[PDB]
Design a binder for this molecule. Structure first.
Ligand SMILES: CCCCCCCCO[C@@H]1O[C@H](CO)[C@@H](O)[C@H](O)[C@H]1O
Ligand SMILES: CCCCCCCCO[C@@H]1O[C@H](CO)[C@@H](O)[C@H](O)[C@H]1O
Ligand SMILES: CCCCCCCCO[C@@H]1O[C@H](CO)[C@@H](O)[C@H](O)[C@H]1O
Ligand SMILES: CCCCCCCCO[C@@H]1O[C@H](CO)[C@@H](O)[C@H](O)[C@H]1O
Ligand SMILES: CCCCCCCCO[C@@H]1O[C@H](CO)[C@@H](O)[C@H](O)[C@H]1O
Ligand SMILES: CCCCCCCCO[C@@H]1O[C@H](CO)[C@@H](O)[C@H](O)[C@H]1O
Ligand SMILES: CCCCCCCCO[C@@H]1O[C@H](CO)[C@@H](O)[C@H](O)[C@H]1O
Ligand SMILES: CCCCCCCCO[C@@H]1O[C@H](CO)[C@@H](O)[C@H](O)[C@H]1O
Ligand SMILES: CCCCCCCCO[C@@H]1O[C@H](CO)[C@@H](O)[C@H](O)[C@H]1O
Ligand SMILES: CCCCCCCCO[C@@H]1O[C@H](CO)[C@@H](O)[C@H](O)[C@H]1O
Ligand SMILES: CCCCCCCCO[C@@H]1O[C@H](CO)[C@@H](O)[C@H](O)[C@H]1O
Ligand SMILES: CCCCCCCCO[C@@H]1O[C@H](CO)[C@@H](O)[C@H](O)[C@H]1O
Ligand SMILES: CCCCCCCCO[C@@H]1O[C@H](CO)[C@@H](O)[C@H](O)[C@H]1O
Ligand SMILES: CCCCCCCCO[C@@H]1O[C@H](CO)[C@@H](O)[C@H](O)[C@H]1O
Ligand SMILES: CCCCCCCCO[C@@H]1O[C@H](CO)[C@@H](O)[C@H](O)[C@H]1O
Lengths: 306, 306, 306
């Protein structure tokens, strides 16, 4: 027996997001559907396993869950559970819209209840500290709302989706200023640096969700978001040797969700005949990086360190 | 004799905003006009009284006014005076556009002069402290600009209104990051917690002003603003027992202005056939809460504690 | 021999921006073209000189360049070099599009490489301090991106321009919150106060770049930006006696770039028949202020203090 570290949900999250990116190429490149289906089935399978393992954690290691929940830093990773649940729902929609819709509502109600209970509680003061100002806060505050937005749009609830989209977008712009100031002043310790990948998530998950809700119209907002997204990509690329100062490790899966979301947005830019060359590069880049994550991960489930 | 506490202007402010919300239902529900007129007359009457009392304060308790003005925290409540003056102008416009226009210009010039003199002065440093980072700052910095925007639009000056709208919207997004970080780190003392209601003001006053300037077109921006607004509403609802830890008190009128503004925006969403169910719920919720404020207040003007 | 202080590039920057503002009036007021050409030639000439002087600095005072580069505050002024280079390119486009395009690409690649190397490096922590939070950070982070956006648009690359525009706009909104909080708490020392002029740059350079990329369409975003821009103008006007507490000095050229950008945006508002009266006032105001800078500067190159 062992208690599953909640951050592991980042793995099926990244693979699910990548399935959806490929799904959106099927009409341009039919073989894309098989690639999407394979990734989607693997993501769903891993999600099922991790859900069962987390159920075990709740039953037999509840005090560990309680402690992560009340931590002003570690609580954020719990949002990965409803986020991944929604993305699995989006995947499954291609086969069974009824089950997909159940998962989407469970994830949406769950994430909203989670943030209403815990994110607001921080405003009581005295628990969260300056050192609690971590990229992971984006998970409950931003990513979860964007995921609800795009999943609700998939179900045909575009205007409700806009509400969640707005919550996520404004929450992002309201937190990032203090996060980047904190990173400038305080050197984030090596053990947390892989979570710098989450800094890439807001702009690309934002544009991906936006394009899902607005019928794929590549407009001025979408281009603005891509621009800041690439800026952050370049910054993180420059920072990569510092990020992995103490070695390559499994936390690097933090980059899969934002990169897959970048790839997803690239399919819409391509369909809209906007920056097609950039779109191709972005889509290929994301896939290569996530492929490397998969390979490094196999070259290790092997050694039994996963 | 006594010096009127400047925050009391929040009362006619909330009632005035609520009059305007009902005014905007008259063509859907004719009886709404009588409700609007009654609220508008009560708001105007209370405003007249409070203005006369504040004139008395300026003449006979000037050092108290001077001290509040120079305080890096308490100065903000003075903005309630021109804000309420503008809203009374919007109300009176239905009966006498000439007087309404005088009040709107007096409030607009007044708030702009006030913020130009005092908000900028803070940037000289050394007076404002980290502990000065309070929700009340939204009054001169954000709410006053949105109110000018919507009042100018009422008078037919839409493009000038957009200038004030932009000032308020960007000022909001520029202050909120540091406010929420401060609330996370430092527990706001009980005596100030009722002013957490002002945190609800920016998104709903923003969307209300926006819809006033853009002819009621419920577009993507409006939906985005509503979404963040509801997020903040849910957060504040969860936080309510903490907000009133030391008891229910008259400061809770801080919630009336934002809730009335939410109600106003809901009339436009309803007219635009966007999220009609949400609109109805929001409009009813605001009215019930403000009704409770009125009742608690009567159950007390009685006991002589007002 | 002497090492040129990098901030001096603000002079040709301001004059170049002003040339472009006048250029945009030529079809309304033909004599505007001669005024534009004169300013453009002077700006270009000064830029050539300063470039040659900075080449000398790199060859013979390299350790001074190294120290400014690694400083978490002084590095920002180096961005003036590619920024001015792009604006000279925009000027020269009227005479030789081939040379103009070379300068625009050199400035764009240069600024992007500069920010990718240095702005991201700050996120490693421990070098940048709270006291490093200065208006000058806007140069590499915001102004350089907007300048690329507008210069790329000039060359016909509107969608690539939108990427740079988005990078600059979001970078602005993400830094300003912490800058204004820092100015409120810590009094900026007199020797740095002239750089308060850079606080005026983001909103006006943003709207100028925006109108360059969107074919001059004066829309809701443009009006919103102008509104916040004027708010900041009024604030800085009120603050001016404090800014020059220790005397008038050459650092006041920090105001030329934002004021010239305001003037440029005013030509587009005027062409669009939006707020024509405001546009005229803004254009005249900027020119008078920059004229005063020129006069104060002559009344001094004289005394040999430049
Ligand atoms: C993902 C789920 C983790 C949920 C753990 C939540 C713990 C809820 O919080 C619990 O609330 C109680 C008040 O009812 C207290 O008595 C407990 O001390 C407290 O830990
Ligand atoms: C993603 C799924 C969300 C699960 C969140 C469960 C949060 C439990 O929340 C708790 O519940 C108590 C009531 O017992 C609260 O009053 C406390 O604030 C809290 O500790
Ligand atoms: C913090 C991020 C800033 C968001 C910038 C929003 C820019 C919205 O841009 C708008 O988009 C429309 C669609 O192409 C345009 O037609 C409008 O002309 C323009 O005002
Ligand atoms: C992120 C979006 C990725 C889209 C992948 C498209 C790859 C196809 O690539 C392209 O195909 C075109 C016609 O199909 C060709 O004419 C182009 O030359 C070629 O670049
Ligand atoms: C801060 C935002 C930076 C975004 C930079 C995008 C870089 C350009 O991207 C590239 O652009 C070329 C245009 O010169 C294309 O020909 C290529 O096909 C494309 O790969
Ligand atoms: C709502 C109105 C309150 C206005 C009080 C403003 C006080 C103005 O400030 C006053 O300015 C003077 C400089 O002229 C000083 O001599 C006084 O010390 C100072 O208090
Ligand atoms: C809402 C109405 C606005 C009233 C604001 C009055 C502000 C008075 O402002 C004062 O005036 C002095 C001149 O005597 C200033 O120079 C000072 O900065 C200030 O203390
Ligand atoms: C900080 C808040 C962010 C503001 C987000 C602005 C989104 C503007 O959104 C825009 O709105 C228009 C009207 O429906 C659209 O048609 C455009 O297609 C889109 O770019
Ligand atoms: C905030 C906006 C509040 C608007 C209140 C509308 C209340 C009317 O309620 C409605 O009236 C319709 C026709 O009038 C009915 O057909 C609907 O069933 C009913 O829900
Ligand atoms: C973070 C933003 C959260 C906004 C959540 C809005 C909740 C839904 O709002 C409700 O939506 C239902 C749709 O299922 C409707 O049928 C109801 O009529 C409406 O009351
Ligand atoms: C505008 C140009 C200024 C460039 C100065 C950049 C200095 C680059 O940084 C240098 O990098 C080296 C690592 O290669 C180190 O050995 C030096 O110590 C370091 O100063
Ligand atoms: C505007 C023109 C940009 C010039 C920026 C040059 C930055 C040099 O950058 C340096 O280069 C090293 C490699 O030697 C880096 O690895 C270091 O991070 C850095 O010190
Ligand atoms: C941080 C700055 C906030 C940006 C606000 C963006 C407002 C975009 O505003 C939009 O602009 C379009 C063009 O006029 C409109 O038609 C749309 O109706 C509206 O949603
Ligand atoms: C920033 C934009 C400045 C534009 C300068 C325009 C100055 C012209 O000024 C104007 O010219 C019009 C016709 O040309 C006249 O009819 C107007 O009365 C007059 O105000
Ligand atoms: C916070 C944003 C403040 C912007 C205020 C702009 C002030 C008005 O600007 C002026 O507006 C008049 C309208 O009364 C015009 O008649 C004038 O021609 C114009 O100069």
């Amino acid at each position: 027996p062992f208690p599953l570290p909640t951050g592991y949900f980042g793995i099926p999250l990244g693979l699910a997001a990548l399935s959806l990116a490929w799904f959106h190429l099927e009409n341009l490149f039919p073989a894309a559907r098989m690639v999407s289906d394979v990734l989607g089935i693997v993501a769903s399978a891993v999600w099922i396993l991790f859900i069962l393992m987390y159920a075990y954690k709740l039953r037999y290691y509840f005090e560990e869950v309680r402690a992560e929940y009340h931590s002003p830093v570690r609580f954020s990773f719990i949002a990965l559970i409803p986020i991944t649940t929604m993305l699995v729902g989006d995947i499954l929609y291609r086969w069974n819209p009824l089950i997909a819709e159940v998962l989407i509502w469970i994830g949406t109600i769950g994430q909203l209840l989670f943030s209403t209970l815990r994110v607001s509680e921080l405003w009581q003061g005295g628990v969260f500290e300056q050192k609690s100002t971590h990229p992971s806060f984006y998970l409950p505050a931003v990513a979860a709302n964007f995921t609800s937005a795009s999943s609700l749009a998939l179900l045909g609830y575009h205007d409700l989706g806009y509400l969640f989209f707005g919550a996520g977008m404004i929450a992002w712009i309201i937190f990032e200023p203090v996060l980047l100031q904190h990173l400038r002043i305080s050197s984030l310790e090596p053990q947390f640096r892989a979570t710098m990948g989450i800094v890439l998530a807001p702009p690309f998950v934002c544009v991906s969700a936006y394009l899902s809700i607005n019928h794929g119209e590549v407009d001025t907002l979408a281009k603005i978001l891509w621009g800041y997204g690439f800026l952050q990509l370049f910054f993180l690329l420059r920072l990569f040797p510092w990020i992995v100062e103490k070695g390559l490790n499994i936390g690097l899966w933090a980059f899969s969700f934002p990169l897959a979301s970048m790839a997803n947005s690239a399919t819409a830019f391509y369909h809209g005949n906007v920056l097609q060359g950039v779109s191709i590069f972005a889509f290929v880049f994301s896939n290569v990086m996530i492929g490397l994550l998969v390979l490094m991960t196999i070259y290790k489930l092997t050694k039994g360190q996963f």
